Amino acid sequence: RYDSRTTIFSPEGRLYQVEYAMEAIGHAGTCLGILANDGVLLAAERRNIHKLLDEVFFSEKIYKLNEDMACSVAGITSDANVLTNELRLIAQRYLLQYQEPIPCEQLVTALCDIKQAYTQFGGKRPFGVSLLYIGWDKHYGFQLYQSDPSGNYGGWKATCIGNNSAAAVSMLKQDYKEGEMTLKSALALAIKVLNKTMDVSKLSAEKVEIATLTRENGKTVIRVLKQKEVEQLIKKHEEEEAKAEREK
Amino acid sequence: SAGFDRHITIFSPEGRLYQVEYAFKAINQGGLTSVAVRGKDCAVIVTQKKVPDKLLDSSTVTHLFKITENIGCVMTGMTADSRSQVQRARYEAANWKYKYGYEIPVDMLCKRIADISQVYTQNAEMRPLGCCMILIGIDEEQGPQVYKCDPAGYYCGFKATAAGVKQTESTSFLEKKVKKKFDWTFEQTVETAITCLSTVLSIDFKPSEIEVGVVTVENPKFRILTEAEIDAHLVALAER
Amino acid sequence: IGTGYDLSASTFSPDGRVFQVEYAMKAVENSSTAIGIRCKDGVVFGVEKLVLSKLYEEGSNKRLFNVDRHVGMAVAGLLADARSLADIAREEASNFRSNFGYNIPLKHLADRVAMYVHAYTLYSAVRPFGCSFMLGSYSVNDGAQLYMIDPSGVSYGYWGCAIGKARQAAKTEIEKLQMKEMTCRDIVKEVAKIIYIVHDEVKDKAFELELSWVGELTNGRHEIVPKDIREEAEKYAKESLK
Amino acid sequence: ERGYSFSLTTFSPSGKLVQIEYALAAVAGGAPSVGIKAANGVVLATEKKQKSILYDERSVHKVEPITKHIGLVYSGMGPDYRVLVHRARKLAQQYYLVYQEPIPTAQLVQRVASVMQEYTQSGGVRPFGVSLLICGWNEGRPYLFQSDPSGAYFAWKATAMGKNYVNGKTFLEKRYNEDLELEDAIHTAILTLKESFEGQMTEDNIEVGICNEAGFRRLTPTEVKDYLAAIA
Amino acid sequence: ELMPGASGAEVKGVCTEAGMYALRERRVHVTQEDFEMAVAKVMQKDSEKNMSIKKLWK
Amino acid sequence: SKMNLSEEVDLEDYVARPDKISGADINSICQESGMLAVRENRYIVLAKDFEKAYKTVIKKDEQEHEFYK
């Protein structure tokens, strides 16, 4: 059949290796990002915390790339690390060449060009990694982009990739009020999405990984939600859910 | 299950590299057998000699070689692979002498040649040189060393080792000898090695079918046991 | 039968043997028979060259090369492989002369060429040299040596050996010949008669006999047997074969 | 599913590369090894059991130091572990040369994981059949990491891979506590070795190494024998 | 809530196993703990024991 | 139980040895013990033939090349 090296074309025109790289992301941890009026956030699931992981870390799924850049990863760990290192490399190369933080579109296109080159030629397996870039620029303010192992990308305001990503994005689009969400509403929506999309009746703060990017006073600050902060957020959501169910 | 034994670089299910074990069997394919024994201050290697006809020059059919002036070597398996391996070992030893200014220890030489073999077994561009290796020598503050290298890149130190078709039986006999916890003087080391070969082959060999090489602290030079000395040793053993 | 493992020279077999090398062995065994004998003060060579058609000139496909001024070259197997091997051996000898400043010992030359032919055995993108060749030389301060190197890459020293379809027969016929004493004069006749008996006339006829030697009789220089010595050797072969 | 278990550059239609999983299976068949992170330091242990006591146990070591404060232990192939040791030493020395500062264990783990994954990039080269355990102490904190043939690297409070790794992990999670002390950490590691050791660990049958504020040091056979006598 | 993604047959099996936990102690009533252990027993499934395999994906 | 008396052999220690052996292997160990006792013509098993039977049954011979571990 036509399931050999990626540089092959099915008679119907499909790139089967690229398609398998697509469908492989469904095995990765669920991560989503939402665009709010005055902030952006990345919510990711810690699928593997058994009992004895040191948690010596800043974020596993979320990776900071530049003083204005942050992204979440979903795919094979090796390709994840390679893509993140290349992201840092290209961002700093743009900063050196132009003395300006790299735009989100430009960096995303650079990474996607690399990924396409990894499926265009050479007999090399495509990067089985899908990304969710978060950042700010003077060109378009706050932007969210969802990458793709095929080398495609798209500008989104709400997107979930990983396991159960289809249902998560479906309910998210069913429950997204564009242009009228602050950071708090976006955080609550992300918590509700993670509740509905993960296989736990009461998800813990350990399984949740949230990082928020916000531009304030001339500079953009990227911070991951501390343990106390994320615990307070999830408890606020569970009391909101309790209020909703008792009212019903 | 099977079908993964075609390429050296292919991992089979349950993580088994077949081609490496196939090379290990190619080692026994040589049809010969060798043993090495180490004493308190001596290390003796002795290998069997098969001569199909007097037509061969017996002086050039040696199976044990000299890596450096004080490091000896003996091998079994595919003889062309063995000669390539000793050429590589000599290259490595002299290059080490150049770069670091002192003679290559046996452990480091075995480590480097095993690294070479591992690199060969890691990429599918080579046949992994299916011949075993045994080195002997003397190092200060440590004494004699006996070191064995295999196509897999695995190297280890041996108080006494073996190679060839009779690997298992020779190792069992050497186990039986070593568990008695005896000092192993030079003459008795040579005697134990010769008895190991004779019992594992059950031939009671004539003295002309064996070559022996020893290294001692008083004679660090890798001396190949000439015909007169092997005759003395093994006839004395027969009478003793 | 080894199917699935003999398609490349870098793949072993369950028995632990590279079948490409054994197939090169078989190719050599299915070729013409060449013998060589090392006398007291030199070595001599003999080849059973089959003239496949009378149209070929005498001396066509010269199978007795001369690697160096003092080094003989007797081959068997594939003539193209043999010529390539002779060329690389000549290059090796020339490099040894250029770097070390003196004639290459036969044992060292045999070691280097065996290393090369082995290097052509353990790859997958190349194929082992399907020819077995002989090496002979005579040095006043070293002596006379003879070496047989086969596609396996092994280089053993033989008193006097043969390669070809008449391997075993020439082994038996050369065993009864006592070898160590005489010089080239009393060994060329023997080589001629051995080659003339091992050759089969009923099948695979029309062969011609060619000899070469190196020694102090030619000042340690490898060259073809002179015409007079060649014809007297042929006459001895005819009278001995009766 | 068979046609996709033969190359490292082809995705299986359902999941991912199968050769990586096969290398991991090779890792799982190696000699058992455990590593435990105590409050003040880290300890890692492995068994050196091999037949034919003719073998010189002092000749090779399964526990080697990368620098003055980093040690590593494998579970799988020997020669691949040796190559990994050489590569890790080279990376650590390069980092030292450029930064003039001892290499933090996290950066070493990232670099060595990249090195292992670079052997998974293309076909014709096989992934290392070795999983590493990295122990280190810096910034007043003991670190323990595991490096994988796939290039994935993750931290570990206390783990045990190799042969019988599942039972070792169950024992460790039933025994390990965050407030553990270094000596009790070594005791727990030795017991984890013991429960599946099959043959009454001697002073040389097992090899252990410790790391703390005073750097990484492989324990001498005398201290191993003393700890074994204390555990009994 | 303790049975995420459990088919109806598994729910019936949970009821049956809680009843059996009651039976083993020779009682007739069923307590919440019985249902909890029944859920644990019925929905018990083999996970990926090797953490290294499980950590292939991010 | 149906076996003859074992003359005070460390059955509890034999149990205590950590070995991944099934009940079929234990039955085999006892069966081998009986065979050895018959072969050497003594009806009362002791530690020698029981131990030989134990080694025979649970041999678990590997010989695996060292580079694997």
- Touching D (3+ Cβ pairs <8 A), the chains are A, B, E, F
Which residues, 6 or more positions from A149, have their beta carbon under 8 angstroms from its beta carbon? A18, A21, A22, A24, A25, A75, A115, A126, A127, A128, A129, A130
* Chain D (62-121) residues lying within 8 Å, Cβ to Cβ, of chain E: none
Identify the contact set of chain C against chain B, taking CB-CB distances under 8 A. 4-5, 9-18, 107, 111, 114-115, 118-119, 121-124, 145-147, 152-161, 171, 174-175
Helix (H, G, I), strand (E, B) or coil at D135: strand
Chain D, nearest residue to F69 by Cα: D30
Token pair of A46 as six digits: 């810690």
A127, A154 Cβ separation under 8 angstroms: no
- Cα distances (angstroms) measured from residue B203 to each of B29, B194, B198: 20, 11, 6
Locate A60 and state its tokens. 């596993």
Residues in chain B within 8 Å Cβ distance of C157: 56-57, 59-61
Helix axes F23-39, F47-57, angle to 10 degrees: 130
- Dig out the tokens for E53 from the structure: 């395999």
Q: How far apart are CA A19 and CA A27, in angstroms?
A: 14
Q: How far is CA D221 from CA B145, D45, D99, D205, D226, in A?
A: 20, 13, 35, 10, 9
| D229 token code pair | 């006598």
CA dihedral B24, B26, B28, B31 (to 10 degrees): -170
Contact check, Cβ <8 Å, D155/A17:
no
DSSP letter string, F57-68:
HT-------GGG
Residue of D11, D18, D24, D144 best to disrupt the E interface, most CBs of E under 10 A: D24
Spatial contact of C38 and C146, defined as CB atoms under 8 Å apart: yes
Q: Which residues on E lie below 8 Å from D21 (Cβ)?
A: 53
Residue B56 neighbours by CB under 8 Å, 6+ apart: C156, C157, C158, C159
- What does the block give as tokens for A159? 């997107």
Cα angle A58, A63, A67 (rounded to 5 degrees) comes to: 95
β-pairing, D63-65 with B160-164?
A: unpaired
How many other β-carbons are positioned within 10 Å of the β-carbon of residue F27? Answer: 11
Amino acid sitting at position F45: V
Q: If contacts are CB pairs under 8 Å, which of residues 113-152 in chain A contact chain E?
A: 129
Between vectors from CA B30 to CA C33 and to CA B155, what angle results, nearest 5°? 140
Helical ranges in chain D per DSSP H: 18-28, 78-99, 105-118, 165-175, 182-195, 221-231
Q: CB distance F68–B156 less than 8 Å?
A: no
d(CA C124, CA B6): 12
Query: Residue D203 is encoded by which pair of tokens?
Result: 């002073």
- Angle formed by the axes of helices D78-99 and B106-122, to 10°? 100
Map residue A142 onto helix, strand or coil: strand
Under 8 Å between Cβ of C31 and C82: no
Distance between CA atoms of A157 and C214, rounded to whole angstroms?
A: 90
Residue contact A128–D113, C-beta within 8 A = no
CA distance B45 to B42: 10
Query: Can you tell me the distance from the alpha carbon of B46 to that of B198, in angstroms, rounded to the nearest whole number?
Result: 11
Query: Residue D171 maps to which CATH number?
Result: 3.60.20.10
- Phi (first) and psi of residue B74, to 5 degrees: -145, 145
Residue D211 vs residues A57, B145, C62, D96, D172: alpha-carbon distances, Å: 21, 31, 73, 19, 19
Chains D and F make contact, 3+ CB pairs within 8 Å: yes
Return the closest-CA partner of residue A44 out of A184, A191, A188. Answer: A191
A10 touches chain D (CB under 8 A): no
Q: Of B10, A30, A128, A119, nearest to D13 (Cα)? A: A128
Q: Which of B152, B156, B168 is opposite residue F65, by nearest beta carbon?
A: B152
A205 touching E (Cβ < 8 Å): no
**Neighbour-count burial for A108-136, b at 16+ CB within 10 Å, e otherwise:** bebbbebbbebbeeeebbbbbbbbbbbbb
**Nearest 5 degrees, angle CA D123-CA B23-CA C23?**
95
- Chain E touching partners, 3 or more CB pairs below 8 A: A, D
Chain D closest-CA separation from residue A2 CA (Å): 12
For the domain bounded by B1-240, which CATH number is listed?
3.60.20.10
DSSP per residue over A82-136, as a string? HHHHHHHHHHHHHHHHHSSPPPHHHHHHHHHHHHHHHHHSSS-----EEEEEEEE
List the structure tokens of A122: 């050479």
Instruction: Tell me the CA distances in angstroms from C195 to A81, B72, C45, C175, C236, one per residue in order.
Output: 71, 43, 11, 14, 12
Give the closest-approach CA distance of E33 to chain A in angstroms: 18
Question: Which H or E run includes C114?
Answer: helix C106-119
**Minimum CA–CA partner of B107 in chain D:** D59
Rounded distance, CA D159 to CA E52, Å?
11
Distance CA B154, CA D159 (A): 26
Residues after which chain E is broken (C–N above 2.5 A) are none
Experimentally determined by = cryo-EM
- Residues in contact with D149: Cβ distance below 8 Å, sequence separation at least 6, in sequence order: D20, D23, D24, D27, D116, D120, D127, D128, D129, D130, D131
Domain boundaries, chain B: 1-240
Instruction: Please name which of B142, B135, B138, B239 lies closest in space to residue B191, comparing C-alpha atoms.
Output: B239
> How many angstroms separate the CA atoms of A207 and A248, rounded?
29
A55: tokens are 């948690």
- Written as six digits, the tokens of A160 are 């979930």
CA distance A199 to A163: 10
Type and span of the H or E element at A194: helix A183-197
Q: Is the dihedral of CA A92, A93, A96, A97 positive or negative?
A: negative
Q: Which residues of D touch E46 (CB under 8 A)?
A: none
Residue found by looking up tokens 């594992």 in the block:
B200
Strands of F1-69 (E only): list them: none
For helices D105-118 and A77-98, the axis angle rounded to 10 degrees is 110
Residue of F nearest to D48 (CA): F69
Query: Contact at 8 Å (CB) between F1 and F11?
Result: no
> Where are the alpha helices (H) located in E1-58, listed in sequence order?
8-24, 32-42, 51-54
d(CA A188, CA A238): 10
Write down the residue that tokens 């452990």 correspond to.
B107
Please give the C-alpha separations between residue D25 and each of D22, D75, D109, in angstroms, as whole numbers. 5, 11, 22
User: Quick one: tokens of C5?
Assistant: 């493992």
D25 → chain F, closest CA residue:
F68
Q: Which residues contact D143 (CB under 8 A, 6 or more apart)?
A: A54, A56, D37, D42, D105, D106, D134, D135, D136, D137, D155
Q: How far apart are CA D17 and CA D21, in angstroms?
A: 7
From chain D, pick out residues whose CB is under 8 angstroms from the CB of F19.
198
CA distance C146 to chain B (A): 9
Long-range contacts of F48-51 (CB under 8 A, 24+ apart): F50/F6, F50/F9, F50/F14
Alpha-carbon distance A76 to E18, whole Å?
A: 41
Touching status, chains B and D (3+ beta-carbon pairs under 8 Å): yes
In total, chain B counts a number of residues equal to 240
**Which tokens in the block code for residue D48?**
């050196």
Query: Which domains can be identified in chain A, with CATH numbers?
Result: 1-246 (3.60.20.10)
Closest by Cα among C88, C157, C95, C92 to C126: C88
Check: CB of residue A125 under 8 Å from CB of residue A82: no
Q: What are phi and psi of C99, to 5 degrees?
A: -90, -40
| Among B115, B147, B152, beta carbon nearest to D83 | B115
Of B16, B154, B168, the CB nearest to F66: B154
Checking DSSP bridges between strand D141-147 and strand B131-139, what pairing results, if any? unpaired
Nearest-5° angle of CA A110, CA A116, CA A122?
A: 125
Q: Which two tokens stand for residue F48?
A: 């020698």
Q: What 3-state DSSP class applies to D207? A: strand
Query: Which stretches of C166-226 are DSSP H helices?
Result: 167-175, 185-198
- Per CB distance under 8 Å, which residues of B are interface residues toward D? 3-4, 8-17, 107, 111, 114-115, 117-119, 121-125, 145-147, 152-161, 171, 174-175, 178-179
Amino acid (1-letter code) at residue D110: Q
Three-class DSSP labels, chain B: CCCCCCCCCCCCHHHCCHHHHHHHHHHHCCCCEEEEEECCCEEEEEEECCCCCCCECHHHCCCEEEEECCEEEEEEECHHHHHHHHHHHHHHHHHHHHHHCCCCCHHHHHHHHHHHHHHHHHECCCCCCCEEEEEEEEECCCEEEEEEECCCCCEEEECEEEEECCHHHHHHHHHHHHCCCCCCCHHHHHHHHHHHHHHHHCCCCCHHHEEEEEEECCCCCCEEECHHHHHHHHHHHHHC
- Burial of D33 by CB count in 10 Å (0-12 exposed, 13-18 middle, 19+ buried)? buried
Distance CA A224, CA A41 (A): 9
Vertex D22 angle, CA B10 and E48, to 5°: 170
Q: Which of B65, B69, B107 is nearest to B213 (CA)?
A: B65
- Which DSSP string do the residues of A21-89 spell out, in sequence order? HHHHGGGSPPEEEEEETTEEEEEEE-----S-----SS-SSEEEEETTEEEEEEEBHHHHHHHHHHHHH
Q: Report the C-alpha gap between D126 and D119 in whole angstroms.
A: 6
Q: Is the separation of the CB atoms in D171 and D192 below 8 Å? A: yes
The residue behind tokens 């002795």 is B46
Return d(Cα A52, Cα D178) in angstroms, integer: 9
Q: Do residue B56 and residue C155 have CB atoms under 8 angstroms apart?
A: no
- Does F63 contact B168 at a Cβ distance shorter than 8 Å? yes
Cα dihedral A74/A77/A82/A88 (nearest 10) = 60
* D52 alpha carbon, distance to own chain's centre: 25
Interface test mutation site (partner F, options D197, D198, D207, max chain F beta carbons within 10 A):
D198
Q: Report chain B residues whose CB lies below 8 A from the CB of F65.
A: 20-21, 24, 150, 152, 154
Q: How far apart are the first and last CA of chain D?
A: 49
Element (H, E) at F54: helix F47-57
Determine phi and psi for F61, rounding to 5 degrees.
-60, 135
CB C224 within 8 A of CB C146: no
Question: What sign has the CA pseudo-torsion B28, B30, B33, B35?
Answer: negative
| SS3 category, C87 | helix
In degrees, rounded to 5, the angle at the alpha carbon of residue B155 between the alpha carbons of residues D221 and D115 is 90
Instruction: Tell how strand B143-149 and strand B155-158 pair up.
Output: antiparallel
* Order of strands, sheet of C64-68, starting from the edge strand that comes earlier in the sequence: C64-68, C71-77, C131-139, C143-149, C155-157
Alpha helices per DSSP H over C134-213:
167-175, 185-198
Helix, coil or strand: residue A10: coil
Report in angstroms the alpha-carbon separations of C10 from B7, B24, B153, D1, D147. 9, 14, 17, 27, 32
Bridge partner list, A34: A41, A158
In degrees, rounded to 5, the angle at the alpha carbon of residue C145 between the alpha carbons of residues C142 and C151 is 135
Residue for token digits 């700890």? Answer: D227
Range of the domain at D61: 2-231
Set out the domains of chain C in order of their start, with CATH numbers: 1-240 (3.60.20.10)
Distance between CA atoms of C42 and C140, rounded to whole angstroms?
10
**Nearest-angstrom CA–CA distance, B42 and B137:** 9
Closest Cβ opposite residue A77 in set D150, D155, D173: D150
- Tell me how crowded residue A20 is: count the other CB atoms within 10 A of its CB: 23
3-state secondary structure (DSSP) of residue D212: strand
Whether residue D148 and residue E52 make contact (CB cut-off 8 A), yes or no, is: yes
Q: What is the DSSP secondary structure assignment for residue C219, as one 8-state letter? A: T
DSSP-derived letter for residue C218 is G
State how far residue A3 is from chain D, nearest Cα, in angstroms.
Answer: 8
- Spatial distance between the Cα atoms of C106 and C94, rounded to a whole number of angstroms: 13
Distance between CA atoms of A22 and D13, rounded to whole angstroms? 10
Q: Sign of torsion, CA C212 C214 C218 C221?
A: positive
Name residue, tokens 């232990």.
D73
Using CA atoms, how far apart are residues A205 and A184, in angstroms rounded to an integer? 17
Number of folded domains in chain D? 1
Q: Could you tell me if F63 lies within 8 Å of chain B, comparing CB atoms?
A: yes
Token pair, residue F10, equals 């460390």
B57 CB neighbours in chain C (<8 A) are 145-146, 156-159
Amino acid identity, position B96: W
Identify the CA nearest to B177 among candidates D54, D58, D56, D204: D54
Within 10 angstroms of residue C152's Cβ, the number of other Cβ atoms is 22
Q: What is the CA radius of gyration of chain F?
A: 14
For chain B, the straight-line distance linking the first and the last C-alpha, in angstroms and rounded, comes to: 55
Cα–Cα distance, A125 to A129 (Å, whole number): 12
Residues in chain D with CB shorter than 8 Å from the CB of E54 are: none
Contact C137, C106 (CB under 8 A): yes
Q: Which residue has the tokens 């469908």?
A: A23
Return d(Cα F17, Cα B123) in angstroms, integer.
43
Q: Does F66 touch chain D if contact means CB atoms closer than 8 Å? A: yes
Encoding tokens for residue F61?
């011979």
Report the b/e string of C68-103 with b at 16+ CB within 10 A: bebbbbbbbbbeebbbebbebbbebbeebeeeeeeb
- Cα A131 from chain centre: 5
